[PDB]
Amino acid sequence: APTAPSIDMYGSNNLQFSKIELAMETTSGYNDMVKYHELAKIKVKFNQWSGTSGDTYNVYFDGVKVATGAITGSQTTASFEYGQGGLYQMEIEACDATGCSKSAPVEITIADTDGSHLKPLTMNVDPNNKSYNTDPSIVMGTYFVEWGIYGRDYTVDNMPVDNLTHILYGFIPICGPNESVKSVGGNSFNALQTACRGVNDYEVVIHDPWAAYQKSFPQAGHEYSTPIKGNYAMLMALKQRNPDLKIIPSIGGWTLSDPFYDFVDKKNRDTFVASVKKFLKTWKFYDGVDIDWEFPGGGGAAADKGDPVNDGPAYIALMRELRVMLDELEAETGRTYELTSAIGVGYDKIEDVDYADAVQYMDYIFAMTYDFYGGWNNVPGHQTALYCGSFMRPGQCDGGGVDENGEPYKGPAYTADNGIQLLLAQGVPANKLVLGTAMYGRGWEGVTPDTLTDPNDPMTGTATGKLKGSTAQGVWEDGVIDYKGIKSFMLGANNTGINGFEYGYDAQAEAPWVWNRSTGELITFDDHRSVLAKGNYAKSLGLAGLFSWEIDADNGDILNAMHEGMAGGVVTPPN
Numbered sequence: 001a002p003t004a005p006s007i008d009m010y011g012s013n014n015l016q017f018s019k020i021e022l023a024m025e026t027t028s029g030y031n032d033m034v035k036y037h038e039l040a041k042i043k044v045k046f047n048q049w050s051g052t053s054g055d056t057y058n059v060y061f062d063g064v065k066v067a068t069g070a071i072t073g074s075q076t077t078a079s080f081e082y083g084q085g086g087l088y089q090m091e092i093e094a095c096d097a098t099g100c101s102k103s104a105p106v107e108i109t110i111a112d113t114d115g116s117h118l119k120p121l122t123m124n125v126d127p128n129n130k131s132y133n134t135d136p137s138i139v140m141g142t143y144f145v146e147w148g149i150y151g152r153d154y155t156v157d158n159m160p161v162d163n164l165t166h167i168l169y170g171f172i173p174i175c176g177p178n179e180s181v182k183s184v185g186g187n188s189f190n191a192l193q194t195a196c197r198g199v200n201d202y203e204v205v206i207h208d209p210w211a212a213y214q215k216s217f218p219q220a221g222h223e224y225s226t227p228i229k230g231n232y233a234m235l236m237a238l239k240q241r242n243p244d245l246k247i248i249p250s251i252g253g254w255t256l257s258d259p260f261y262d263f264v265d266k267k268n269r270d271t272f273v274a275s276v277k278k279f280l281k282t283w284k285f286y287d288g289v290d291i292d293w294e295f296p297g298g299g300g301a302a303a304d305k306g307d308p309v310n311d312g313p314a315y316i317a318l319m320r321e322l323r324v325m326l327d328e329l330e331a332e333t334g335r336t337y338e339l340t341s342a343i344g345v346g347y348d349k350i351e352d353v354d355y356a357d358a359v360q361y362m363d364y365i366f367a368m369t370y371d372f373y374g375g376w377n378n379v380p381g382h383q384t385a386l387y388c389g390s391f392m393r394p395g396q397c398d399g400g401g402v403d404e405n406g407e408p409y410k411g412p413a414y415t416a417d418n419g420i421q422l423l424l425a426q427g428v429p430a431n432k433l434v435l436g437t438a439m440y441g442r443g444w445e446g447v448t449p450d451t452l453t454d455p456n457d458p459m460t461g462t463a464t465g466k467l468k469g470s471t472a473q474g475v476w477e478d479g480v481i482d483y484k485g486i487k488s489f490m491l492g493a494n495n496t497g498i499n500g501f502e503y504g505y506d507a508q509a510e511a512p513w514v515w516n517r518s519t520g521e522l523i524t525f526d527d528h529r530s531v532l533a534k535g536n537y538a539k540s541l542g543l544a545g546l547f548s549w550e551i552d553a554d555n556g557d558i559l560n561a562m563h564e565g566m567a568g569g570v571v572t573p574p575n
């Protein structure tokens with residue numbers, strides 16, 4: 001028989017192959033950093049220094065023949081292509097008329113972006129997240145943010161994945177007009193300019209490739225030379241752990257919506273929709289797309305954008321077009337892909353889209369039932385309440401009243417039920433609506449007791465400015481605090497108030513607050529009681545389930561309450 005191939009490990013890239021090439025020590029244009037191949041090019045060098053070399057080689061993976069070719073003397077390079085990622089025991093055999101001889105087996109890795117080469121992720125979840133057996137039909141969603149790995153120090157293996165059905169990954173930008181991103185300060189706008197160098201406008205990119213795929217996480221067993229790293233390799237390894245988990249990129253958001261206003265021109269939608277198909281072929285762990293345009297008709301971060309007449313028809317077309325695209329991917333892959341969107345729920349946002357037409361294309365609508373009130377002005381109110389609070393005036397709830405100056409309210413007040421009912425009344429199915437819960441508070445200072453028109457209700461006061469605090473307190477920007485900061489700095493363990501805050505609850509709105517009467521610090525948020533009330537409301541109306549913004553800011557209490565409030569419930573999944 002021929003001499004047995006001896007595999008040259010260092011001559012064959014120590015048997016590490018990747019279907020994706022990712023730039024690792026530089027930051028450039030997305031199309032210069034990211035190259036994906038349908039088949040990996042496998043090249044394995046071997047030698048046969050003694051004896052006869054033979055005529056032909058065969059490559060085996062786990063005992064099955066995957067490639068064959070000619071022997072070239074004493075040194076041969078086996079070159080072939082292979083589509084399926086994984087870890088395999090490879091053997092190379094040499095054959096001639098006399099017989100065949102084979103190398104010892106050695107493990108080959110073929111990386112792919114479904115995580116098929118990876119073991120299930122090792123988790124490191126705060127043990128305050130409890131276990132439940134919520135019915136699998138119910139959505140339990142949340143947003144994980146790409147930048148949460150910096151100061152917030154919250155990584156993929158921290159998520160309580162067994163308690164989630166959907167992870168929306170916040171956020172994928174669209175190249176093009178993006179002045180709103182300058183409002184975050186720091187390097188975010190300039191990072192986007194780098195990502196978009198050499199990329200056509202209206203195509204998606206990764207905003208932060210360091211966080212997405214370059215940074216080595218030692219808890220995920222990453223090495224500097226590991227071919228895929230960052231949050232994306234962790235999400236791949238999470239999907240190996242929990243294969244029924246849906247991981248969906250979220251396009252847009254508050255700061256990254258400015259390009260959507262140009263989707264009134266179909267040409268820009270076509271560019272966008274093709275890029276999203278490419279994106280999902282590249283990054284196979286994703287299961288669909290979520291569109292967070294804030295908002296058709298305007299009222300988002302860009303004060304100079306928004307077309308009430310045209311943006312709704314654009315949104316609907318987008319959804320129509322994205323669904324055609326996703327149907328192509330389902331044909332190509334055999335997989336099921338979801339199309340969703342987070343939407344505003346004020347009456348003036350919902351009136352700009354004919355959702356009866358859009359929703360036919362969509363699996364879920366994540367109703368943004370939060371940010372109703374906040375530190376952008378000095379008017380207290382409940383930011384995430386189901387119903388109208390005590391603080392509201394006669395006829396403010398349904399919009400038929402007049403304000404304190406005698407001016408007509410222009411529509412119903414901002415509450416979760418006013419927006420859910422406006423969506424239902426136009427024919428959006430209940431079982432496609434997902435109700436939002438807040439893992440953060442918004443707040444004010446200067447709401448001192450002398451400013452209240454009703455002394456029992458700090459939501460009848462007036463502020464002097466936004467809540468201020470430090471990042472250790474969960475205050476990453478003025479007027480906004482993580483729920484785990486409210487719990488550590490205002491509620492305490494027994495939920496009865498610390499540091500001069502008192503707890504209160506508006507039983508008519510279903511909305512909690514904490515109030516320090518000395519500093520006039522007032523914070524509106526969601527707590528155990530209000531999130532049980534959202535679960536009971538969702539069960540009562542047959543909504544699809546609950547989602548939350550943002551998972552790093554919880555300590556387990558809010559996600560636990562989402563599940564508790566859903567106990568016993570089942571729902572019909574949309575077809």
Ligand SMILES: S=C=Nc1ccc2oc(C3=NCCN3)cc2c1
Pocket residue numbers: 147150151184186188255
């Ligand atoms: S690098 C470092 N820190 C970072 C890097 C990127 C970031 O993005 C945000 C942001 N805040 C609201 C929406 N996006 C914060 C933030 C901090």
Ligand SMILES: S=C=Nc1ccc2oc(C3=NCCN3)cc2c1
Pocket residue numbers: 184254255371374376
């Ligand atoms: S980053 C960013 N985060 C956000 C996310 C949502 C938001 O809503 C507002 C708001 N401003 C006036 C009315 N609503 C600000 C704002 C900032």
